[PDB]
């Protein structure tokens, strides 16, 4: 239970932990 790509208050493409876009599951940094 997260939100996703639709509008821009708390709702973000990869705002979640598990289940999210290619760049956010690929190695970010820290």
Instruction: Kindly provide the radius of gyration, computed on alpha-carbon positions and rounded to a whole number of angstroms.
Output: 10 Å
- Approximate helicity band: 10-25%
**What kind of sheet is the major sheet?**
none
List the secondary-structure elements in sequence, H or E.
H
Shape designation: elongated
Query: Class by helix and strand content?
Result: little secondary structure
Number of domains: 1
Strand-residue fraction? under 5%
| Helix count, DSSP H or I runs of 4 or more residues | 1
- How many strand elements? 0
Give the termini separation.
24 Å
PDB class: toxin
Keywords: Alpha-HELIX, two disulfide bonds, C-term amidation, toxin
Assembly: monomeric
Entry title: Solution Conformation of alphaA-Conotoxin EIVA
Please explain how this structure is put together.
The chain is mostly loops and 30 residues long. The protein has one domain. 13% of the residues lie in helices and 0% in strands. It has 1 helix and no strands. The radius of gyration is 10 Å and the shape is elongated.
Write a compact overview of the structure shown.
The protein has one helix and no strands.
What characteristics describe this protein?
two disulfide bonds; toxin; little secondary structure; Alpha-HELIX; 30 residues
SSE blueprint and pairings:
Layout: H1 22-25
């Amino acid at each position: 239970g997260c939100c996703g790509p639709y509008p821009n208050a708390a709702c973000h493409p990869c705002g979640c932990k598990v289940g999210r876009p290619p760049y956010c599951d690929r190695p970010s940094g820290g």
